Every structure is written in structure tokens, then in C-alpha cells.
């Protein structure tokens, strides 16, 4: 089982151009992997202060290092975790549950549709389903139980969807192709200069993808 | 409870007859300490020792319990200012799962929405909430996905009342090519009777007494015998002489016949709150306080009442959105001082009857149903009884408090629901057992009111004009 | 019966072909299956299936588990033989089969095998490696009992 | 429903059984228990031999009111002749007091002070003879078949712990054999 | 594939034994799967409905053929099999509760109501027998033979507190006392060392 730790070219700018542009050879190696995670870097002053003093406490004054009462209350040792994995691997014989299988069958459809939406108007394989399905038994190996459950398996959908959505991700049209600045302020002006109502605006307005993108940006832009 | 009487006896010994000591040991036996039993026993002629050793409601909406449904165990748990978000989320989830178990009791199958959209061909009678997201975008929702629904050339049944914010059943095909689910016929999910329902609740408590012990025939017998408990039901204002005149003739009929249970309706004032001009030196508060004082004066004019009659207040739509805490004590101080058998129930409320489920709820359902249909009296009753809920509407229409939706849930089917409508005529009909009534207006019906007999379930109208 | 081993013992499927035509296959949409179709069948049903006639309803073909290769293989070196993969219910199963068929020879064979197994199982009992895993159910249960007996005995010696 | 064993007696239960054993003592004194079986006797003269049941002697020893005499049969030279007899008797399990195991365990707890140098002496002997007896049980145990089982001489304790094994096996043998007919 | 639900349930019972083996006895039965029981009921109901159907049709179109009786004889056994599985299952299921009724009385919620009904009647019945003796028994506890006579016990979260004299139970205070009162307090778990 292989564990990767890469660096795209030019650091954090690789996500500012098209979201691909990372492996120069091809994407078939990543299709032969299981989980792909993208680490970002966003400023949050409270998070920044917390990550600061958390790390100062790690270096000095052993504040995070309290752990002994935590040992008294949680995770008494690492070697304990190792002995537990040795016991866990050969004993349980995990397998999924039949009532949970129809859920995954209906879900792989939605992910492949998600790729259809981002692809045809503008890499998933069945090995991706193979990756989703094994995490279920891993947490099951923690529970040590021989069957699988509905609620015990669906947690994995959140963890895998988090790893691949980052992988995938008349007026307007003939007025502003770029679409910027032509929204509700300007649109209200243009229409004003006789059926438009602000409430009606937000209702009737809500497959021009320009309105979606404008919503993401132009909304708090004001116009 | 577990005890050892041989250990108990020398403690009890510190002469005393065996019969008295044994009797008190047996009787005190249910009470136990850790133990504290010594403290209670030391507290204790034969008559004095024998006496010394010895030592029907209304459900409060704000003080009721809370039970949560579990789809995995199919049972309820011991659940117990403002509520939480998790509660808002689990709100709609609980309704669908209760309806889910109701569907399993009625045994052409069950399948969620994602499974059909996961397929692409066909043929199912899907279950879900008729919501709407965009123009022509009539969505349906279960806990696994959404799907656009169409009623293009549909001939549904002559249902009770197809309304949005209602869990219904529609048959058709998916046809993912346009991704538009089609409807053959819209039908409503059937509701089963209260008999088999209460048979299958289990053996716990859903009303307040923990198990189920409704096996006392004396309850049914006493109701069949005690005709002493009569109900009186009266919209009712306070600032008109006509109201005073009506109360004069009413109290004239009540001073003679002593009633038992008064039901004072809502809407105690013709005007609402939110005063902003102090020209006439008054406000809605002072005016309402004086109206209560006038009502207290009319109530105190005849002291035959309250001697053996219990009273009930009901807050209306113009007091200081459902549910609603009652009218504050600050406006009922004088009436509470004069009388002693008063109560201030929430709207709605339930009367805790030893063997029956009587519920009282005042609102205008019919005044909203004509303006919200897709495309009579029994239709209304059929809707409320089949849906098993008081408010089948979205929260973006009727803002529901997150904590007490359980109170509003019609689990189970009640015995008699007092629905005081202000826009439909008065009636009383039966449908699968739950006797649904309607008193109608009270003033514009040329001064009419109702009086109900619980034993023989008789319904008589009483008019002064 | 109420013993878990009984329903467990009758659960194993046995390939015995019926002598007659059988409409209504319980296992496909023929509907009737021609005679002498070999199909594995549970011991409970198939046990008395041919008992009713006076010609029996089932041929009761010899068990593959009881093959001469198996039987002599077990006659060779019992300590090493693994019963757990082949059945794993063996003594409790074979007694039922042998009651149906009523042969005296192999009973006299298996008994000695059981005796040596007992010898050996009691030898590991005093307090491994891989053998302790291949034992049949009944011997396992007895092993647990024997283990607690001795553990508790020596523990009984002191505290 | 205790469920344990249920066929075997618990070790502590057999200890409860051996409680019934009478034994000689030397009381410090120079009564009339109405309970069940003692019925005896008048106040005994100090340092004089009198037979009494085991558990009451345990009591008196706990209060140190009696001087327990050591059992005459338990003498190292006698165990030596026993072990001698054992090396020459592959089959016979000859003499055992039959309750001696639990006795020695109890006598060494308290009564140890009265004996003359039992320490590091007979303790080894009883253990040695014990294990050689166990294996001689095993050698005769390989012969086991219906219908006879040679029970000859053994202390009840070991018989009790070995009980589940042989008892549950022989039934299978008899069943398959007779059943085959 | 057919009597399969029986295999799953009987198997769960088998595992529950081993789950209860040492164990320590903390045994809290996971649940009563009535859904699987419903499946059994649906299969038997379908089977005997067709069985009665053919039994009626036997006078018209089957004409009481000898082969037709076989299927009745088959399903009857299958029925017994189903029955047998549930019987044994419940018998052990009941047994374990019975044991739990004995040991700690003394001196859940997830499980099916029928069990609690039986349970409450069982415990009431055993109290009736406790009333009968009047021996005294005290037959549900006092499993270990006593010796000798006094013991040193330490308090287990009990303060507290009374029989014959009030001893003033105090948290984390070990005593030296006779077995008697200890026997009662141990039933509530209030005492720890023995």
C-alpha cells in the first residue's frame, strides 16, 4: 500500500490557473490511486493565533505535551494501537451488508453524473468505487463486528466526496458575455429604463451558468 | 422492590405485635432507602401507629415530555432556553420516519428517490413531500435526494385536500432523458383507526401517569354513570355591550344549571397590540387589562359559578406562529384572586382524560385551504385525520418552534379534537372514530354556542336568538 | 431438537439423488425434475426423505466426505489430519449418517481416531501452535471446560 | 441457577465436603453446641488428645486455643516407602488418605508450627509423588474404552477435575457403538 | 437460502453463548430481530396458503396424486425446522434472562416487551417461592460456602447508608466485618473487596 506526498509546480498558484495542470505525464496514475487531497492555505486570524500558540505550546512549556491526564482518559499508548491492529487484521472477516449495497449503487451514479456536469458543458473509474467500499470495512475492523451496516458505511461517502470534489472543481447573454457588472443594480436599471420587482427579481432570476457564477461573485460585489 | 423482612424485623423491634409490625413492614416495603428506611421508620394506641405508618387532568404543552423515534430500533427513548439547529434538522426527519412506520403497518413497494434516479428505465409509487424550488420545478423530497415532478395531463383521485407541504403518493415513471418524473395519479396516504393504532403502541405511556395500564373498566363505567361532567364551549370579545348582554343571558342559564367545564375561546379583543400614539392616554395593554377587569366584574356578578365548576382560558391570535405560551398573569391577577378553578392552556392543548384523548385547538384551516390547492367538510376532516398532523405546511409558511413539534404530532389518534374554526359553519361528524366537531362563530351566528356531553357523545346547539 | 448442534448438524447439504420424478423443485423453473438428479440436500429433510416409500424416495449416494481416500487418510496419522476444513462437524454428523446407512466397520474405525484425538487434546490441555485451530466443535467445548478446571485448581491451591 | 459446574463439584465445594473430617487436638482449656452432630463433650484437659471435626479446629486454631497434633500417617519415611512402592507398581495406585491434598494445604497454613522440619522436606515429596501419580493416571488413561474404567486409588480432588473429559467422551463411544447395531 | 433466516438467528445465538463465556457476565443481549421473524412468518404464511390451496384443489384438478402429498410432508418439516429455530432461540434467549433474574435479585429497554412481561411474572413467581420458604431461602444468592467468619470489605461508591445496627456507610472506607451484611450490600455493588 503506497502513501504519497507531492508538490505541484509553483506552489499555491497551481489552483489559480485551470485546476488541472499538476502531473505532467497523465492522470492515469492518480486514477490508480484511491484518495486525492488538496491542502489549501487560508488566513483566519483566530485560526492563525491558535495555530501559533498551539505550536509555541508544543515547543515550550509542554502545554500540549496535559497528555498524561489525557492518557488517563484517552488513548493510553501508541504501542497499544499497534497491538490492536495486529489483533484486528486477521480476526475479523468483514463484508458489506446487502441493505447498504443499493445505496452505493445509487451513489456511483451521482458521482459519474457530477463528472458529466463538469466535463461535457465545459478521473473516475470503478476503482474509485473500489476505494469507497474498502473504508467501510476498515472502520468495521475497528468495531470488530462481522457485518456491515447502513449508518456504519455512509460516513465514508463524506470522506470520499471531500477528496474528489476538490479534484473535479437572453438579456445577460446578448448584453454582457463576461456577465460582470450587468446584474441586479444594472439589470434593475436597464429594465427600469416594467414587470420587474425586486422580490420578483430574486424569484424569477433564481441554464445560464453565468447567473450561478455571478451569484458566487457579483452578489457581495453589489452589482 | 427487594428487601429482607428477617433483617427488617429486629430493627422494627426496637412490645409490638407481630401483626402490626408485619403489616407496616409490608406496606412500607415499596418505599426504600439506600437505607433511608431507618429514617422513615423511626418517625413512626394501635390506631395512632396504624395511621402514622401510612405516610383526570389537562396536558400542559409547555410541560409535556419528549420522545424521539429511532428508525433502527422502531421505538422511543427517554429524551428529557431556545432550541438548537440539530433539532430543526431532525424535525422533518421524524415526520417522515413516523409516516414510514405507518406505511409498513399497511404492508407496489418502498424505494427511495436516489435509487430511481440512479436507474434510467422502468415504474414506482414514490412517497415524499410536495415542495417547490423554482417555476415549474415541483420537487419531491425523502431523506435521500430530490426529483422534479410533473402533473402533465394527470387525472388524480378526488382526494381530501392535495396541498403543498404534504407527504403524498404518486405513481409514474422517471425517464431520466429529461429527468422529469411523471405522475399518473396523486393520492393521499391512508390513515388507520385509533383502535389498532393504540393496540400497537406497546405498553408505555403516551399521555401521562412507566407503562400502559388502561385496563380499568371503572373508568368507562364512571363516564357512563357520572353525567356530572358537562362541557361548555363558546371567538369572544370583551369591549361591547352585546357581549355583556350575551353573558347576562348565558350566566342566567348557568346560574341555574351548574356546569362543569367552561371552555373560554380565544380572541379576547377586537384590536391587536403595537401602540405608538399616547393621545388618549392608553395602550393595548391598559385597555386589555381593563377588559379583563370588566370580565372579572361580570364574572363576580354571579357567585354560583366556580363553586363547583372548573374554567379554561384560551389565548387567541391577538395576545402578547404556533405553539404559544398563554396569557401572562399580569392581566389575570384580579380574576385569579376572585376565582379558584381557572387554568391557562396553550393553543393547542389536550385534556388528560383517564380513558380518552380530548384535544382543543383554535385556528382557521379552511380560510387557507381554498387559496393553496394544486388544481367538503368531510374533506377537511379527512385531511387532518389522515395526515396525522395539525399543521401540514412548510416552516417557511408557518414558523414552527423547534422544541414542541412533538406536541403537535397527532400520535396517536385522539378521541375528540376541539377545532374552533372562525370561517366555516358549525358541525360535528364522525370519521373512523375520532369525533371531529366545529362550534363555528359565536357572535355573527346570531349568538350561538355549544355544550357537549362526553358519555353519550351528544351534540346540542344552544341559541338565545 | 433444542441443542444448537442439532439444527447445526442437520444444516449441512448432502448430494443424494431421488429415485422418482419431482414436481415443485424447492431449489430451476422446470417445473418437474427428472429422477436421479443429484442435488445436495439438508440432513434433516433428506434423512427421512427416502425413509418413506416401500421403495425409498432417494438413492442416498455415498458421501464425498466419507470417501475411501478420506477414510484411509484418517486411518493413517490422526494427529496431523485436519477435520475442520472438510466438514467441520464430523463425529456428530457421521453418527447421524451412519445411523441412516447402518455400517459397523467405519464406526469401529473412527472410534479409535477419536480416542487418540482425546489423548492428544488432553495433552495440550495442561498449561501451541497451529493444530489447536483445526479441532472440531465438541472437542473445543470440552477443552474450554478442562482448561478452567485446571486453572482454577492450581488457583485453588493458593488464593 | 448456578450452572457451574454443573456436573463437577467446585473445588471450594469439595473443600466444604472435607470440612466434615474429624481430627485430634490438644486444647488450651483444662459448650453444649446444640446444632447437629458434635454432642460432645465436657471441658477437656490441657494438652490432651481429643477428636473433633476439621472446621471447628480451624476456628480454635484461629484463636490459638488448641494444639493440633500432626497426623501420624504423614511422615516423610512413609512417603518414601510409598514412592518406592510406586516405582515398582506401574498399575496400582496403592495408598492415599484420599483427602490428604487439601489437608496438607491447610496444615501448612497454620499447623506448620507443630511439625518437625516439614519445610523444604515433605512438601517436595508430596509434589513429586503427586505428579508421578498423575502420569501413572495418564498411562492407564490411554487404555480407556467402554465399559470398564480403573478407578483404583486416588485423591478425590484430581478425580473431580478430570471428570468432564472422560465422562463426556465415553458416552460418545457407547452411543456410536451400540447405535451401530 | 430457504431456512436461511433460521441459520442466521441460530448462529447469533451460538455466538451469544461464547459472548457470554467467561465473559465477565456483562451480558446485555443486543436485540430481538423481529424483522427476520416477520420474514419467516411471510414465508410460512405463503407456503401454508398455497398448501391449503392445493389441499382444496386436490379434489378437483390434482385428484389426490401420491406425489402431491410429498410437498405437504416437506413443508411440514420445514415448518418444524423454522419452529425449532425460534423455539431454541427463544429458549436460550429466555434462559439468559432467567439467569440474570436469579443472580442479582438481590435481596434491557432494547429487548422485546414479551420478555419483560415474562420477566416480571417470573420474578414475581420466584418471589412467591421466596415467600414459601420460610426456611429461609435466600435461594437465589449465597452461592459460595462461607469461611471464616469475618472478612475485610471496602466501600464501592456507597455513602450511605442498617440491618440489625446502622453502620454508617462511608465512601472509600474499608472495614473488617462478618459475611452477613456484606452479602446484602454486595448485591447492590456497594462493596468491593471480598
Swiss-Prot record, chain B:
Keywords of this entry: Cell cycle, Cytoplasm, DNA replication, DNA-binding, Nucleus, Phosphoprotein
Modified residues annotated as Phosphoserine in this record: 391
Swiss-Prot/TrEMBL GO biological process terms: DNA-templated DNA replication; DNA-templated DNA replication maintenance of fidelity; error-prone translesion synthesis
Entry's localization field: Cytoplasm; Nucleus
Reported modifications of this chain: Phosphorylated in a cell cycle dependent manner during late G1 phase. Phosphorylation may facilitate the interaction with POL2 or the activity of DNA polymerase II. Phosphorylation is independent of DNA replication but dependent upon CDC28 in vivo.
Recorded GO CC terms: cytoplasm; epsilon DNA polymerase complex; nuclear replication fork; nucleus
Gene Ontology molecular-function annotations: DNA binding
Annotated signal peptide: none
Cross-referenced InterPro entries: DNA_pol_a/d/e_bsu (IPR007185), POLE2 (IPR016266)
Family: Belongs to the DNA polymerase epsilon subunit B family.
Quaternary context: DNA polymerase epsilon is a heterotetramer consisting of POL2, DPB2, DPB3 and DPB4.
Comment field (misc): Present with 3110 +/- 251 molecules/cell in log phase SD medium.
Role of this protein: As accessory component of the DNA polymerase epsilon complex participates in chromosomal DNA replication. It is required during synthesis of the leading and lagging DNA strands at the replication fork and binds at/or near replication origins and moves along DNA with the replication fork. It has 3'-5' proofreading exonuclease activity that correct errors arising during DNA replication. It is also involved in DNA synthesis during DNA repair.
Official protein name in the record: DNA polymerase epsilon subunit B
Organism name: Saccharomyces cerevisiae (strain ATCC 204508 / S288c) (Baker's yeast)
Amino acid at each position: 500500500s503506497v502513501l504519497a506526498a507531492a508538490n505541484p509546480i509553483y506552489g499555491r498558484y497551481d489552483d489559480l490557473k485551470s485546476p488541472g495542470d499538476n502531473i505532467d505525464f497523465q492522470t492515469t496514475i492518480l486514477s490508480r490511486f484511491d484518495m486525492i487531497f488538496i491542502v489549501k492555505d487560508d488566513h483566519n486570524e483566530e485560526r492563525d493565533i491558535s495555530i501559533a500558540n498551539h505550536v509555541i505550546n508544543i515547543h515550550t512549556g509542554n502545554a500540549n505535551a496535559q497528555n498524561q491526564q489525557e492518557e488517563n482518559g484517552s488513548e493510553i499508548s501508541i504501542e497499544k494501537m499497534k497491538r490492536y491492529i495486529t489483533y484486528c487484521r486477521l480476526k475479523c472477516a468483514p463484508r458489506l451488508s446487502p441493505q447498504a449495497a443499493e445505496k452505493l449503487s445509487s451513489n456511483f451514479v451521482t458521482i459519474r453524473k457530477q463528472l458529466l456536469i463538469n466535463e461535457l458543458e465545459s478521473p473516475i473509474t470503478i476503482r474509485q468505487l473500489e476505494a469507497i467500499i474498502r473504508i467501510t470495512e476498515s472502520l468495521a475492523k475497528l468495531e470488530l463486528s462481522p457485518i456491515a451496516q447502513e449508518r456504519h458505511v455512509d460516513e465514508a461517502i463524506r470522506l470520499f466526496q471531500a477528496s474528489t470534489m476538490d479534484a473535479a472543481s437572453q438579456e445577460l447573454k446578448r448584453r454582457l458575455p463576461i456577465g460582470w457588472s450587468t446584474s441586479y443594480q444594472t439589470l434593475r436599471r436597464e429594465f427600469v429604463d416594467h414587470r420587474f420587482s425586486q422580490l420578483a427579481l430574486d424569484k424569477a432570476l433564481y441554464e445560464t451558468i453565468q447567473l450561478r457564477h455571478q451569484g458566487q461573485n457579483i452578489y457581495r460585489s453589489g452589482v | 422492590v427487594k428487601i429482607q423482612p428477617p433483617l427488617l424485623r429486629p430493627l422494627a423491634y426496637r412490645s409490638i405485635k407481630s401483626d402490626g409490625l408485619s403489616a407496616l413492614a409490608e406496606f412500607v416495603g415499596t418505599n426504600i432507602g439506600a437505607p433511608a428506611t431507618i429514617k422513615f421508620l423511626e418517625q413512626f394506641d394501635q390506631s395512632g401507629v396504624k395511621e402514622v405508618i401510612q405516610e383526570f387532568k389537562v396536558i400542559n404543552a409547555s410541560q409535556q415530555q419528549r420522545f424521539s423515534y429511532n428508525p433502527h430500533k422502531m421505538q422511543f427513548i427517554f429524551v428529557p432556553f431556545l432550541p438548537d439547529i440539530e433539532d430543526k434538522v431532525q424535525m422533518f426527519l421524524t415526520r417522515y420516519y413516523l409516516t414510514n412506520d405507518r406505511v409498513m403497518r399497511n404492508e407496489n413497494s418502498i424505494t427511495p428517490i436516489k435509487n430511481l434516479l440512479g436507474r434510467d428505465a422502468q415504474n414506482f409509487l414514490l412517497l415524499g413531500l410536495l415542495n417547490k424550488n423554482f417555476k415549474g420545478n415541483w420537487s419531491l423530497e425523502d431523506p435521500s435526494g430530490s426529483v422534479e415532478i410533473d402533473i402533465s395531463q394527470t387525472i388524480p383521485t378526488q382526494g381530501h385536500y392535495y396541498v403543498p407541504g404534504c407527504m403524498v403518493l404518486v405513481e409514474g415513471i422517471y425517464y431520466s432523458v429529461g429527468n422529469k418524473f411523471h405522475v399518473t395519479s396523486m393520492t393521499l396516504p391512508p390513515g388507520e383507526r385509533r383502535e389498532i393504532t393504540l393496540e400497537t403502541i406497546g405498553n408505555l405511556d403516551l399521555l401521562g401517569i412507566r407503562l400502559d395500564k388502561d385496563l380499568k373498566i371503572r373508568l368507562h363505567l364512571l363516564e357512563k354513570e357520572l353525567t356530572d361532567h358537562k362541557f361548555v364551549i363558546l371567538n369572544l370579545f370583551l369591549d361591547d355591550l352585546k357581549i355583556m348582554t350575551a353573558l347576562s343571558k348565558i350566566l342566567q342559564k348557568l346560574n341555574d344549571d351548574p356546569p362543569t367545564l367552561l371552555i373560554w375561546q380565544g380572541s379576547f379583543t377586537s384590536v391587536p397590540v403595537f401602540a405608538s400614539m399616547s393621545s388618549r392616554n392608553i395602550s393595548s395593554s391598559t385597555q386589555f387589562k381593563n377588559n379583563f377587569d370588566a370580565l372579572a366584574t361580570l364574572l363576580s356578578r354571579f357567585d354560583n359559578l366556580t363553586e363547583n365548576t372548573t374554567m379554561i382560558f384560551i389565548p387567541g391570535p391577538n395576545d402578547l406562529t404556533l405553539p404559544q405560551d398563554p396569557i401572562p398573569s399580569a392581566f389575570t391577577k384580579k380574576i385569579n384572586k376572585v376565582c379558584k378553578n381557572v387554568v391557562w392552556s396553550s393553543n393547542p392543548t389536550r385534556i388528560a382524560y383517564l380513558s380518552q384523548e380530548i384535544v382543543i385547538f383554535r385556528d382557521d384551516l379552511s380560510g387557507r385551504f381554498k387559496r393553496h390547492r394544486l388544481e367538503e367538510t368531510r374533506k377537511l376532516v379527512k385531511t387532518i385525520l389522515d395526515q396525522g398532523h395539525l399543521s401540514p405546511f412548510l416552516d417557511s409558511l408557518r414558523p414552527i418552534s423547534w422544541d414542541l413539534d412533538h406536541t403537535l404530532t397527532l400520535c396517536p389518534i385522539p378521541s375528540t379534537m376541539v377545532l374552533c374554526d372562525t370561517t366555516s359553519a358549525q358541525f360535528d361528524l364522525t370519521y373512523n372514530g375520532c369525533k371531529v366537531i366545529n362550534p363555528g362563530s359565536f357572535i355573527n351566528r346570531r349568538a350561538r354556542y355549544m355544550e357537549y356531553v362526553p358519555s353519550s357523545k351528544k351534540t346540542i346547539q344552544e341559541e338565545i336568538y | 431438537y433444542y441443542d444448537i448442534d442439532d439444527v447445526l448438524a442437520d444444516g449441512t447439504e448432502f448430494p443424494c439423488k431421488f429415485q422418482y420424478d419431482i414436481p415443485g423443485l424447492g431449489y430451476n423453473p422446470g417445473r418437474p425434475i427428472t429422477k436421479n438428479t443429484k442435488l445436495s440436500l439438508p440432513l434433516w429433510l433428506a434423512r427421512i426423505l427416502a425413509i418413506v416409500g416401500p421403495v425409498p424416495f432417494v438413492e442416498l449416494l455415498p458421501p464425498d466426505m466419507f470417501s475411501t481416500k478420506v477414510m484411509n487418510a484418517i486411518k493413517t496419522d490422526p494427529v496431523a489430519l485436519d477435520l475442520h476444513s472438510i466438514n467441520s462437524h464430523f463425529f456428530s454428523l457421521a453418527i447421524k449418517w451412519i445411523m441412516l446407512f447402518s455400517e459397523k466397520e467405519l464406526a469401529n474405525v473412527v472410534s479409535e481416531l477419536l480416542l487418540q484425538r482425546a489423548q492428544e487434546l488432553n495433552h495440550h490441555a495442561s498449561s501451541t501452535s497451529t493444530f489447536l485451530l483445526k479441532l472440531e466443535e465438541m472437542e473445543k467445548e470440552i477443552y474450554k471446560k478442562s482448561h478452567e478446571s485446571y486453572k482454577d485448581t492450581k488457583r485453588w491451591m493458593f488464593k | 441457577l448456578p450452572a457451574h459446574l454443573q456436573q463437577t463439584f467446585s473445588p471450594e465445594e469439595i473443600q466444604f465436603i472435607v470440612e466434615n473430617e474429624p481430627i485430634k487436638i490438644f486444647p488450651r482449656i483444662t459448650w453444649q453446641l446444640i446444632t447437629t452432630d458434635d454432642k460432645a463433650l465436657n471441658n477437656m484437659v490441657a494438652m490432651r488428645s481429643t477428636e473433633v471435626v476439621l472446621w471447628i479446629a480451624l476456628l480454635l486454631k484461629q484463636q490459638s486455643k488448641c494444639s493440633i497434633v500432626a497426623p501420624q500417617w504423614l511422615t516423610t519415611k512413609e512417603l518414601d516407602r510409598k514412592i518406592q512402592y510406586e516405582k515398582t507398581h506401574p498399575d496400582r495406585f496403592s495408598e492415599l488418605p484420599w483427602n490428604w491434598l487439601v489437608l496438607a494445604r491447610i496444615l501448612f497454613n497454620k499447623a506448620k508450627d507443630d511439625f518437625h522440619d516439614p519445610i523444604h522436606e515433605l512438601r517436595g515429596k508430596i509434589q513429586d509423588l503427586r505428579e508421578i501419580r498423575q502420569i501413572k493416571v495418564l498411562k492407564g488413561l490411554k487404555y480407556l474404552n467402554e465399559s470398564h474404567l480403573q478407578l483404583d486409588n486416588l485423591s478425590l480432588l484430581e478425580i473431580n477435575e478430570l471428570r468432564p473429559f472422560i465422562t463426556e467422551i465415553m458416552d460418545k463411544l457407547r452411543e456410536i457403538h451400540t447405535a451401530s447395531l | 437460502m430457504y431456512g436461511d433466516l433460521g441459520n442466521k438467528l441460530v448462529l447469533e445465538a451460538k455466538r451469544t453463548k461464547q459472548l457470554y463465556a467467561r465473559s465477565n457476565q456483562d451480558v446485555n443481549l443486543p436485540m430481538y430481530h423481529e424483522d427476520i421473524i416477520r420474514n419467516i412468518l411471510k414465508e410460512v404464511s405463503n407456503l401454508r396458503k398455497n398448501t391449503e390451496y392445493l389441499k382444496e384443489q386436490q379434489q378437483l384438478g390434482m385428484l389426490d396424486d401420491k406425489v402431491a402429498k410429498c410437498q405437504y410432508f416437506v413443508t411440514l418439516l420445514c415448518m418444524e425446522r423454522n419452529k425449532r429455530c425460534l423455539l431454541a432461540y427463544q429458549r436460550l434467549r429466555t434462559d439468559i434472562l432467567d439467569s440474570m433474574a436469579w443472580n442479582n435479585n438481590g435481596l434491557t429497554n432494547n429487548l422485546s416487551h414479551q420478555e419483560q412481561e415474562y420477566l416480571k411474572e417470573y420474578c414475581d413467581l420466584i418471589t412467591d417461592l421466596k415467600s414459601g420458604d420460610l426456611v429461609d431461602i435466600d435461594l437465589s444468592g449465597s452461592l459460595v460456602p462461607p469461611s471464616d467468619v469475618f472478612i475485610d470489605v471496602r466501600v464501592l461508591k456507597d455513602a450511605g447508608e442498617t440491618e440489625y445496627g446502622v453502620f454508617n456507610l462511608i465512601k472509600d472506607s474499608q472495614f473488617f466485618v462478618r459475611q452477613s451484611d456484606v452479602e446484602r450490600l454486595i448485591q447492590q455493588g456497594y462493596l468491593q473487596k471480598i
